Amino acid sequence: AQYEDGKQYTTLEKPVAGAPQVLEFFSFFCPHCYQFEEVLHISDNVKKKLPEGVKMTKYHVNFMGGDLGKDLTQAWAVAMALGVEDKVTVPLFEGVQKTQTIRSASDIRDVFINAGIKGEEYDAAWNSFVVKSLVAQQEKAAADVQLRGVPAMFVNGKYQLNPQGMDTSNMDVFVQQYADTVKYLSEK
Amino acid sequence: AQYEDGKQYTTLEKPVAGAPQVLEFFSFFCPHCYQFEEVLHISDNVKKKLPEGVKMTKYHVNFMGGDLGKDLTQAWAVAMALGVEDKVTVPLFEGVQKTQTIRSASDIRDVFINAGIKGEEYDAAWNSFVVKSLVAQQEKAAADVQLRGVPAMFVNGKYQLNPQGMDTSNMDVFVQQYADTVKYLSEK
């Protein structure tokens, strides 16, 4: 409905150049990101309200989970390259945070194999040039907006969402407000 | 020379007389504290490696979260007086960091009642002087060590763990390295 800069969103002094239309950052170690995905379905609700020709991009960050977070960023690149994001997102969140079955990189491989991906294919993707590019692209994107925390969502590389300034008293209302704000800004 | 001052631990320039053997400080607002607790299980692992008769004390701090921060230090004192720590640690961490449904002192009270503590029993403890002394004790302890950040762990009032000098590629190895250092310092 009604939008106020500094309230439901903020503006970047340095508006990132070829930033994706809608860009989301997260970490598999991030508790609130897990809430966003499994309970609220923030990305799905945003997607439903996005106008024609607006795509969403989701990137993983290295700054949580120490050395393992970096491997998770590479595994996220593999998921995108193989297009199995929807098959592995929740299993990876659960593996790191719930069942705690992911304690090293080898455990990540097992999640993919369990989803029906051949190990040879995973290993080849992992060491691919497409994947090294995706990894660098992800790290660059985070650098560009000087990201310091997750979850985070940016629109046109110009605006940053601010759930802090949104009505969180009712979660169904909150989710729609977040989606409407993304829509409002994308057409701005 | 396998364990060095400045490496896996630091020696207090001002030792603390009568300080608990193993003293840990945390905050429900602190992110690495959520990691340390819910994913790494640092306390449990450290506990599993201590000699007999070596007791562990965990205290909450005031310096994060402002108003709610102090309310949580009082709530922790209530958990300690009632002996329900294991019942509320997880929902408090999740309430504050994952769902972000903990916004006032009544929200904290809801977690306890949901955990099985009777309202009358919680309210009585909340207002007690026993809880007041427990709050003072936590504050005095942070002051004795000039605590400026969390998570933190001190041994024999003389040393402070320094997890910065340990590999994080494997969580299990990190956890055992941390636990072995504590054991070492406790018998040092």
UniProtKB/Swiss-Prot annotation, chains A, B:
Disruption phenotype: Induction of the PhoP/PhoQ two-component regulatory system, suppressed by 50 uM CuSO(4). CDD domains: DsbA_DsbA. GO terms for biological process: cellular response to antibiotic. Disulfide bonds join C30-C33. Its main location: periplasm. Keywords: Disulfide bond, Periplasm, Redox-active center, Signal. Required for disulfide bond formation in some periplasmic proteins such as PhoA or OmpA. Acts by transferring its disulfide bond to other proteins and is reduced in the process. DsbA is reoxidized by DsbB. Required for pilus biogenesis. PhoP-regulated transcription is redox-sensitive, being activated when the periplasm becomes more reducing (deletion of dsbA/dsbB, treatment with dithiothreitol). MgrB acts between DsbA/DsbB and PhoP/PhoQ in this pathway. Belongs to the thioredoxin family. DsbA subfamily. This is Thiol:disulfide interchange protein DsbA. It comes from Escherichia coli (strain K12).
